[PDB]
Paper text:
In order to reveal the structural features associated with this new sequence motif, we have crystallized the wild type PMGL2 (wtPMGL2) and determined its 3D structure. It was the third structure of an enzyme from the GTSAG motif subfamily established and the first one with the GCSAG variant. Two cysteine residues, Cys173 and Cys202, were found in the active site of wtPMGL2, where Cys173 was a part of the 172GCSAG176 motif possessing the catalytic serine residue. The side chains of both cysteines were clearly visible in an electron density with a distance between their Cβ atoms of 5.2 Å. However, these residues were not disulfide bonded in wtPMGL2 structure as followed from the electron density. Moreover, structural studies and MALDI analysis did not reveal the presence of the disulfide bond between Cys202 and Cys173, however, it can be speculated that their proximity may allow for disulfide bonding in appropriate conditions and upon small movement of the main chain in the active site region. In wtPMGL2, Tyr208 residue has two conformations of its side chain with relatively poor density. The region 216–237 also possesses the same conformation in both structures with, however, an absence of electron density for the residues 221–226 of one subunit of wtPMGL2 coupled with a high temperature factor and the poor electron density in this region in both structures. Interestingly, PEG molecule was found in the active site of mPMGL2 (but not in wtPMGL2).
Among them, a new esterase PMGL2 belonging to the hormone sensitive lipase (HSL, EC 3.1.1.79) family (family IV lipases) was produced and biochemically characterized. The unique feature of this enzyme is the presence of a cysteine residue in the GCSAG motif which surrounds the conserved catalytic serine. Three-dimensional structures of subunits of wtPMGL2 and its mutant variant mPMGL2 were found to be quite similar (see Methods section). Both of them had a typical α/β bacterial HSL-like fold, consisting of two canonical domains ‒ a CAP-domain and a catalytic domain. The active site of PMGL2 consists of a catalytic triad of conserved His302, Asp272 and Ser174.
Author numbering:
A (entry chain B): 15 to 332
B (entry chain A): 15 to 220, 227 to 332
């Protein structure tokens, strides 16, 4: 928030990115979905230009069990170590955009940094489609990849809305009776509402002098989730002791100034108490989804933590 | 943070503790160290009463290599799980107080929750003593414990100033040529200055830049370059750290330093774990009357239970 100086931990590069992130903030769209989607198409294309400058990858289109995916590989080839591994990426974009370039923006840095194949899923978006459409889509992709890869060697990750869907996909996979994935990354978001202090600090809910700050909702406000109960453990698994016990090893990663931080710190407590192997990282001073901007050492550092989590937690053998 | 509601994650018991914490806040002492020490003696005696009502432990005084300790155990004895393990506690208290009751306030909940022997160190305090006096004292106790316990089965933990001294003791043990401890807990502080956003949000600053050193008399005249004094800022010292638990309240001025320490340990390939308790301040877990404190004690116990060895 505005009274503070930039975190004194940030690289000069990051301080530059923060100025541009603030300057690049969306105008009010007033329900004009077409104008909103155009804005974020340009945003995602802009970050993809930055990704392609830093990383060397090759992308193919594929269809797996009637779901459209992009398969992103390092241009140098997958490492020997990762021959029998694969990651599924679930893009962010507020459950309403991010298809195509936003999906590549999340898949490219991980494919290149880990030296692994990343299958980024073109799941059904809101407002046209509702929960559990995205869960069904990611589970269909997962089901296809089990023909080629052991469950223990498959990771699933996503940023923001993609972190929410990654957690929801886990429960849908269990509902289908499939073996659970080897590990997941619930980045800047998980299967829980936003809670705690961080939504107030990040300015998602206004606070200050003369302001009667309201309580926070116990549901994600997106149309994708409208009408889904708090008590649906498959929709909100990190609030459910039962679905939390069944989670695979989980990475939770956020910027320090991300409205998601308080929810992820509580989710990590719950996973620890449930006996699940989880890891939490916070990058002080950085906002929600900071690692879609690759021109700072902090983003490369995040890609290394994501790669290192999967490299440690996923199985290797065919 | 006056414009914020209490974190909606907190138990009703925690919301009560928040009000008790505010009632218990120190007045301005204007550098009168005697009045300050008297206030914190009373503070620590008050938390000790709370600890004694919640947990059943026995405390013994011992001397190990000329350093005074209290040995804190569950009243009916250490668990079979922990027969070949011991923790060293290093108390907080701004490097100037916390001796005796402060030390028991950190040792009792962990001894009782884990079912383990906790040896809490009566280290030399500022301003009478300066760095590296406390590192020397903790290392002397560690040296004595190696007579009975494998290095891999010894943990060291402390809160606030004690978390700082824990990290500094690690480097001192290495300087002495001893085997490194099995695991440490750098709770609400580590071998690094307070940095990042959290000191501003916690309101321990009104904005100006932050210091690159710890401002305490204990550290006066120690350089930033002393990697033994500030190991979590040194790439070299960080690689040699043992498995580390970092834990703080979400509103603690230590949060940002610990998140960076955790990133540094991960990059260095050290096993580390971070937990943050949304809505709680610095050293929250000296107040045992809330589920969140019991939960913190269980994370501390779980970390040492997973990372310490079991061989005799
Ligand atoms: Cl962690
Ligand atoms: Mg663990
Ligand atoms: Mg690790």
């Amino acid at each position: 928030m505005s009274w503070l100086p930039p975190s004194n931990q940030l690289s000069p590069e990051a301080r530059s990115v923060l100025d541009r992130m603030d300057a690049a903030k969306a105008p009010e769209f007033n329900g004009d979905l077409v104008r909103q989607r155009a804005f974020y198409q340009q945003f995602n294309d802009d970050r993809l230009v930055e990704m392609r400058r830093v990383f060397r990858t090759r992308e193919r289109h594929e269809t797996l069990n009637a779901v459209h995916v992009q398969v992103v590989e390092p241009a140098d080839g997958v490492s020997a170590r990762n021959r029998d591994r694969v990651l599924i990426n679930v893009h962010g974009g507020a459950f309403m955009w991010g298809a195509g370039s936003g999906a590549l923006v999340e898949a490219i840095p991980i494919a290149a940094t880990m030296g692994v194949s990343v299958v980024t899923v073109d799941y059904r978006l809101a407002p046209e489609n509702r929960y559990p459409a995205a869960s069904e889509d990611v589970t269909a992709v997962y089901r296809a990849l089990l023909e080629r890869y052991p469950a223990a060697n498959i990771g699933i990750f996503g940023c923001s809305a993609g972190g929410v869907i990654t957690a929801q996909a886990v429960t849908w996979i269990r509902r289908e009776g499939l073996p659970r994935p080897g590990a997941i990354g619930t980045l800047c978001g998980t299967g829980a509402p936003y809670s705690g202090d961080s939504p107030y600090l990040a300015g998602v809910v206004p606070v200050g002098p003369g302001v009667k700050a309201p309580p926070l909702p116990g549901l994600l406000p997106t149309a994708y989730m409208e009408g889904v109960g708090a008590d649906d453990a498959r929709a909100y698994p990190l609030t459910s002791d039962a679905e939390t016990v069944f989670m695979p090893p989980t990475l939770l990663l956020a910027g320090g100034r991300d409205f998601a931080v308080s929810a992820l710190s509580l989710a990590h407590r719950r996973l620890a108490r449930a006996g699940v192997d989880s890891e939490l990282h916070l990058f002080d001073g950085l906002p929600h989804a900071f690692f879609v901007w690759p021109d700072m050492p902090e983003s490369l550092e995040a890609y290394a933590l994501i790669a290192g989590f999967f490299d440690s937690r996923l199985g290797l053998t065919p």
